[PDB]
Amino acid sequence: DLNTLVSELPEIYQTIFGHPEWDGDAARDCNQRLDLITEQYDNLSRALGRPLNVLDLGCAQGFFSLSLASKGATIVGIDFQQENINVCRALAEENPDFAAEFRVGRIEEVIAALEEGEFDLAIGLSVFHHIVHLHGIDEVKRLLSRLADVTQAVILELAVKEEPFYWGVSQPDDPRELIEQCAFYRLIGEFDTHLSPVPRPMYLVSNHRVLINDFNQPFQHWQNRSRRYFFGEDYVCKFFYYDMPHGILTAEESQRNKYELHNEIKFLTQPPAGFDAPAVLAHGENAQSGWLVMEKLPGRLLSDMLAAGEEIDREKILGSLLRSLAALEKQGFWHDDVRPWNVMVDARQHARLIDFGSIVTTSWPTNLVQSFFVFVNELFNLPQPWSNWLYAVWQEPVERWNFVLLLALFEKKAKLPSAEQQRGATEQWIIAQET
Amino acid sequence: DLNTLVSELPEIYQTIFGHPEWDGDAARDCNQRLDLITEQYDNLSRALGRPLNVLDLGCAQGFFSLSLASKGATIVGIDFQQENINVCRALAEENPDFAAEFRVGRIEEVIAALEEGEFDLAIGLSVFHHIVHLHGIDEVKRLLSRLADVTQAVILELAVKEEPFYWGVSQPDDPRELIEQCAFYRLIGEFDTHLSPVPRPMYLVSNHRVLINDFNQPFQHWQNRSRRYFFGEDYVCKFFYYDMPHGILTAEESQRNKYELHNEIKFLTQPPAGFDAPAVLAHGENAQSGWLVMEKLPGRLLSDMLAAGEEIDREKILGSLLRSLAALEKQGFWHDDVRPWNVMVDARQHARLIDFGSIVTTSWPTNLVQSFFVFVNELFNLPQPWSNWLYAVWQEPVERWNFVLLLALFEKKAKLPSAEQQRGATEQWIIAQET
Ligand SMILES: C[S@@+](CC[C@H](N)C(=O)[O-])C[C@H]1O[C@@H](n2cnc3c(N)ncnc32)[C@H](O)[C@@H]1O
Ligand SMILES: C[S@@+](CC[C@H](N)C(=O)[O-])C[C@H]1O[C@@H](n2cnc3c(N)ncnc32)[C@H](O)[C@@H]1O
Ligand SMILES: O=c1cc(N2CCOCC2)oc2c(-c3ccccc3)cccc12
Ligand SMILES: O=c1cc(N2CCOCC2)oc2c(-c3ccccc3)cccc12
Ligand SMILES: [Cl-]
Ligand SMILES: [Cl-]
């Protein structure tokens, strides 16, 4: 009988599915977490085009398991207390069409035994802090990595050290230390536990997909540490953290990240005429982070080609870059931050800027022209006619320095007088000194 | 200069690729391991239809890395000694067309950072016992799982506790404890280390593919513990361990496994006329283990349907089973071991045997007829006309008991006299008592 199985629960942690006579007794009503979890279930189910297999770790009285089985999910619920599992099976028996199984088992053993592809979605709500408390942080991170490795998505609600209880003392400094080794993660909500005023963050995590409410796609590789890049078949997703764990970002740096991304979004959604910019496939910002999905460009980053000493055509790289810098300038745009790590080189040795967070609209623009000289020097130090080019620019009154001029003198550099035949000289040492 | 970089190696562990003037100095010549590794490289490359990305953990002086890059592999070699990496890069520079990178790093960090799909093949030869010695066995198993999770194949040479040195004392009882949580593994050789007379086993391991020299295919799930089953799109691979770790198998049990598989192979490659048997796609046996790849049958195992109390038609299950048992018997074959875990039931409620290791060719066959009664009882205890069927058989002189008779009385059971109208009686209690 259910009355008996319920009374024997050491704790009525969750709502008893379909049995509201216990809602007043449940530690946690579960409706807020459920609303968020069903939404993420729908997203991933829509993306995969089918009902999902769901794993529920530390599933307690089965509420999220049954509730998802109710929407047509196939669920396995795991808990290490026999009493919790007894209630789960009795509830599944009241719902014989739900495809729902429950097992007494330890989460550590189950994760060691999972096979990639068995489950699309795993949920682990308020369970891992127990494992943290007994096995430590490193083991939990490896468990969580493997859980992300073998599913499409993981949803975690994580207890935090700010909670007032003795076990809080064993928690990482920040719940993100448990998951930051995973590829993709995004805070999706914050929940009241009824134990204290400190809420628990809920995270959506994946080692296989970009899971953004608007764009749900596998990626095949990813790279960095408060910016992440996910590479899919024809996209790059640029993911910025504003809110970072630990001392990582200063107020200042969070705000630059935010500003740079907002700015990249604004530039790319309304590019200037005369400039070829990557198409924007999706974008969004929230308190913790912001993201931008773009069409993916071919080639390698210039910094890589220089580090991994691969062969480069500096004429073609400089000319193509300068041509775009001049086109930009004609429309009243400039790039603050022209560096080898911001430039991509395609197979035909043509270059383009890739980080548009540093695009600005307002002795301008002499400072930028100046650092471009440095850029040129790092790119190589200067042989003729490159040195002749720089020397001609140095002879210009300063109010004439701009990118149209830089480009025009670059295109005629073979006809310009020989710098080493003049005094000359100076400008050599100035640029060399910044570098 | 290479002479210098070599002299600074704390140890010339491997042959210096392309530099035989040091072969006399190398701790290990590497040619035996290399021959085996190139063969496995070729197999997997042939199966994937392309050159492989290879990860070499604790790559020392780069010998296996360079040797594979030489066959067109893209390789990354990792070692935590700067001196080893210095030599690796100098050797790669003598071979500028090899696609080869080397990094100073710790194996633990690198594996935490791997992404599924980056590397097809990882090799870890004589390196993990160092990590065992510092971090313990559980951490090493999780590292090895993740390494299998993110590649197609892993090749490991593992030090063993029988080696005479002090660190042997920290090793697992059996090197297989490091990998047995991985899905697929197969001993492919045994190597002399020149430290002692104890050789080191080399294992081929995968969490994604069945890697058998003749059959190299992804599988999508697997199941058990000295027999493993891998399920691919249209195959089941049945993998038997003869040689198990620890006390697991007795001499007796290894020999039964061997005999049962050999026997399954012999039956299936020459089935009797009149019996529909699964087609054999590949097979092989060696000292440690044996394997059989078969076409995959649809349905569920009868034991599962009974445990997970799913609905069954006992008429159709019994008749179809009996019909095959009678056909078998007509050709002079019997099955020793007719149990619910050896029977599969398709969607039309038709049943077939699946474990043919218990097929025999020689008061026969009364004992088998007897246990079939038990089978029938477990399947259900007997209502009429099932009980009437058994009662008729019990009335037969014993020399007449066989499967043709069992089938013939089963088909007429609705016409047979009512058992409960006779004495009757006995046979009820006999069968009930074995069960
Ligand atoms: C705080 S409750 C959370 C229950 C449920 N996940 C929820 O949030 O609604 C933690 C649950 O995990 C179970 N549990 C704790 N550690 C476990 C482990 N190592 N393996 C399996 N279950 C565990 C407990 O039995 C308890 O039901
Ligand atoms: C015994 S040697 C084996 C070398 C090579 N794998 C072979 O079998 O030919 C072990 C190698 O692993 C390196 N090594 C040991 N522990 C390591 C770790 N934790 N991370 C990276 N390299 C390590 C050592 O520098 C040494 O080169
Ligand atoms: O469109 C892009 C294509 C790439 N390439 C595509 C092939 O993989 C190498 C990187 O990278 C981009 C990056 C980037 C970020 C980190 C490292 C390298 C590149 C930033 C913004 C846009 C792109
Ligand atoms: O052809 C076969 C199909 C199956 N089925 C196919 C679908 O997955 C469930 C098992 O299983 C087989 C097994 C088996 C082994 C362990 C568990 C269950 C079945 C043994 C021998 C042959 C088959
Ligand atoms: Cl938690
Ligand atoms: Cl080892």
- SS3 labels along chain A: CHHHHHHHCCCCCECCCCCHHHCCCCCECCHHHHHHHHHHHHHHHHHHCCCCEEEEECCCCCHHHHHHHHCCCEEEEEECCHHHHHHHHHHHHHCCCCEEEEEECCHHHHHHHCCCCCCCEEEEECCHHHHHHHHCHHHHHHHHHHHHHHCCEEEEECCCCCCCCHHHHHCCCCHHHHCCCCCEEEEEEEECCCCCCCCEEEEEEECCEEEECCEEEECCEEECCCEEEEECCCEEEEEEECCCCCCCCCHHHHHHHHHHHHHHHHHHHCCCCCCCCCCEEEEEECCCEEEEEEECCCCEEHHHHHHCCCCCCHHHHHHHHHHHHHHHHHCCCEECCCCHHHEEECCCCCEEECCCCCEECCCCCHHHHHHHHHHHHHHCCCCCCHHHHHHHHHCCCHHHCCHHHHHHHHHCHHHCCCHHHCCCCCHHHHHHHHC
Q: What angle separates helix A403-411 from helix A366-379, to the nearest 10 degrees?
A: 40
Q: Supply A181's token pair.
A: 């080794």
Q: Considering Cα of B47, then B53, then B54, then B60, what sign does the dihedral take?
A: positive
Which atom of ligand 2 is least distant from the CA of B11? 27
SS (H, E, C) chain B: CHHHHHHHCCCCCECCCCCHHHCCCCCECCHHHHHHHHHHHHHHHHHHCCCCEEEEECCCCCHHHHHHHHCCCEEEEEECCHHHHHHHHHHHHHCCCCEEEEEECCHHHHHHHCCCCCCCEEEEECCHHHHHHHHCHHHHHHHHHHHHHHCCEEEEECCCCCCCCHHHHHCCCCHHHHCCCCCEEEEEEEECCCCCCCCEEEEEEECCEEEECCEEEECCEEECCCEEEEECCCEEEEEEECCCCCCCCCHHHHHHHHHHHHHHHHHHHCCCCCCCCCCEEEEEECCCEEEEEEECCCCEEHHHHHHCCCCCCHHHHHHHHHHHHHHHHHCCCEECCCCHHHEEECCCCCEEECCCCCEECCCCCHHHHHHHHHHHHHHCCCCCCHHHHHHHHHCCCHHHCCHHHHHHHHHCHHHCCCHHHCCCCCHHHHHHHHC
CB B186 within 8 A of CB B43: no
Distance between first and last Cα of chain B:
79
| Contact residues, B window 63-122, toward A, CB-based 8 Å cutoff | 112-113, 115-118
Cis peptide before A385 (omega within 30 of 0): yes
- Please tell me the distance from the alpha carbon of residue B384 to that of residue B155, in angstroms, as a whole number: 60
- Please tell me the distance from the alpha carbon of residue A279 to that of residue B238, in angstroms, as a whole number: 51
Cis peptide before A308 (omega within 30 of 0): no
State the pairing for strand pair A121-125/A215-218: unpaired
Name the minimum distance, in Å, from the CA of B115 to any CA of chain A.
7
- Give residue A179's Cα distance to chain centre: 12
- Within chain A, all domains assigned CATH 1.10.510.10 are found at 298-435
- Please tell me the distance from the alpha carbon of residue B335 to that of residue B55, in angstroms, as a whole number: 48
Q: Letter for the amino acid at B212?
A: I
- Within chain A, all domains assigned CATH 3.40.50.150 are found at 1-219
- Please tell me the distance from the alpha carbon of residue A155 to that of residue A266, in angstroms, as a whole number: 32
Query: Token pair 């067309």 is at which residue?
Result: B97
- Give the other-Cβ count within 10 Å of B91's Cβ: 24
Q: Supply B34's token pair.
A: 């290399």
The string over A40-69, giving b where at least 16 C-beta atoms fall within 10 Å of a residue's C-beta and e elsewhere, is bbebbbebeeebbbbbbbbbbbbbbbbbbb
CB A62 within 8 A of CB A92: yes
- Please tell me the distance from the alpha carbon of residue B143 to that of residue A127, in angstroms, as a whole number: 23
CB B312 within 8 A of CB B350: no
Residue partners of B253: CB distance under 8 A and separation at least 6? B226
Q: Letter for the amino acid at A83?
A: E
- Please tell me the distance from the alpha carbon of residue A194 to that of residue A266, in angstroms, as a whole number: 42
Query: Token pair 């942690």 is at which residue?
Result: A13
Residue of A nearest to B220 (CA): A117
Which atom of ligand 2 is least distant from the CA of B107? 20
State the pairing for strand pair B53-57/B74-79: parallel
Query: Token pair 């029988």 is at which residue?
Result: B162
Residue partners of B213: CB distance under 8 A and separation at least 6? B43, B284
Q: How far is the CA of B105 from the centre of ligand 2 (A)?
A: 11
CB B317 within 8 A of CB B351: yes
Cβ burial of A193 (10 Å; 0-12, 13-18, 19+) is middle
Q: Which of B93, B94, B97, B105 has its CA nearest to residue B71?
A: B97
Best interface-test mutation with B: which of A109, A116, A140, A225 has the largest number of B CBs within 10 A?
Answer: A116
- Please tell me the distance from the alpha carbon of residue B246 to that of residue B135, in angstroms, as a whole number: 23
Q: Supply A215's token pair.
A: 């764009």
Residue partners of B211: CB distance under 8 A and separation at least 6? B40, B43, B44, B153, B184, B186, B204
Query: Token pair 């100098």 is at which residue?
Result: B90
Q: Which of B275, B342, B214, B241 has its CA nearest to residue B267?
A: B275
Distances (CA, A) of B51 to A17, B40, B43, B54, B59: 54, 13, 11, 9, 20
CB A51 within 8 A of CB A38: no
- Please tell me the distance from the alpha carbon of residue A267 to that of residue A294, in angstroms, as a whole number: 13
**Residue B185 backbone phi and psi in degrees, to 5:** -155, 150
Please state the residue numbers annotated as binding site of B for S-adenosyl-L-methionine: 13-14, 33, 58, 79-84, 105-108, 125
Q: How far is the CA of B232 from the centre of ligand 4 (A)?
A: 11
Cis peptide before B278 (omega within 30 of 0): no
Q: Which of A113, A149, A221 sits opposite B146 (nearest CB)?
A: A149
- Please tell me the distance from the alpha carbon of residue A188 to that of residue B349, in angstroms, as a whole number: 47
The string over B259-297, giving b where at least 16 C-beta atoms fall within 10 Å of a residue's C-beta and e elsewhere, is ebbbbbbebbeebbeebebbebbbbeeeeebbbbbbeee
Q: Letter for the amino acid at A399?
A: E
Q: How far is the CA of B394 from the centre of ligand 1 (A)?
A: 55
Best interface-test mutation with A: which of B101, B138, B142 has the largest number of A CBs within 10 A?
Answer: B142
- Please tell me the distance from the alpha carbon of residue A295 to that of residue A231, in angstroms, as a whole number: 10
Residue partners of B419: CB distance under 8 A and separation at least 6? B384, B387, B388, B390, B391, B428
CA atoms within 13 A on the CB side of A117: 10
- Please tell me the distance from the alpha carbon of residue B273 to that of residue B427, in angstroms, as a whole number: 35
The string over A241-274, giving b where at least 16 C-beta atoms fall within 10 Å of a residue's C-beta and e elsewhere, is bbebeeeebeeeebebbbebbbbbbebbeebbee
Query: Token pair 């890059």 is at which residue?
Result: B69
Name the minimum distance, in Å, from the CA of A51 to any CA of chain B.
18
Q: Supply B11's token pair.
A: 């140890």
The string over A114-146, giving b where at least 16 C-beta atoms fall within 10 Å of a residue's C-beta and e elsewhere, is bbbeebbbbbbbbbbbebbbeeeeebbbbbbbb
- Give the other-Cβ count within 10 Å of B435's Cβ: 11
Superfamily name with CATH number, domain A298-435 = Transferase(Phosphotransferase) domain 1 (1.10.510.10)
Residue of A nearest to B308 (CA): A101
- Architecture of the structural domain at B1-219: 3-Layer(aba) Sandwich (3.40)
CB B336 within 8 A of CB B371: no
- Please tell me the distance from the alpha carbon of residue B410 to that of residue B316, in angstroms, as a whole number: 11
Q: Which of A115, A138, A220 sits opposite B117 (nearest CB)?
A: A220
Residue of A nearest to B183 (CA): A115
Q: Which of A246, A216, A214, A242 has its CA nearest to residue A228?
A: A242
Residue partners of A52: CB distance under 8 A and separation at least 6? A41, A44, A45, A68, A73, A74, A120, A121
Domain B220-297: CATH class, spelled out: alpha beta
Q: Supply B304's token pair.
A: 């599962």
Q: Letter for the amino acid at A253?
A: E
Name the minimum distance, in Å, from the CA of A393 to any CA of chain B.
40
Which atom of ligand 3 is least distant from the CA of A223? 16
Please state the residue numbers annotated as binding site of A: 13-14, 33, 58, 79-84, 105-108, 125, 227-229, 238, 260, 295-297, 344, 355
Q: Supply A278's token pair.
A: 């990557």
- Please tell me the distance from the alpha carbon of residue A284 to that of residue A290, in angstroms, as a whole number: 6
Q: Which of A390, A385, A394 has its CA nearest to residue A413?
A: A385
Q: Supply B21's token pair.
A: 């003037």
Q: What is the four-CA torsion angle of A101, A102, A107, A112, rounded to 10 degrees? A: -40
- Please tell me the distance from the alpha carbon of residue B81 to that of residue B65, in angstroms, as a whole number: 16
Q: Which of A304, A183, A179, A299 has its CA nearest to residue A237?
A: A183
Q: Considering Cα of A19, then A22, then A23, then A28, what sign does the dihedral take?
A: negative
Which atom of ligand 3 is least distant from the CA of A224? 16
State the pairing for strand pair A200-206/A153-157: antiparallel
- Please tell me the distance from the alpha carbon of residue B358 to that of residue B259, in angstroms, as a whole number: 9
- Please tell me the distance from the alpha carbon of residue A209 to that of residue A186, in angstroms, as a whole number: 12
- By what method was this entry solved? X-ray
- Within chain A, all domains assigned CATH 3.30.200.20 are found at 220-297
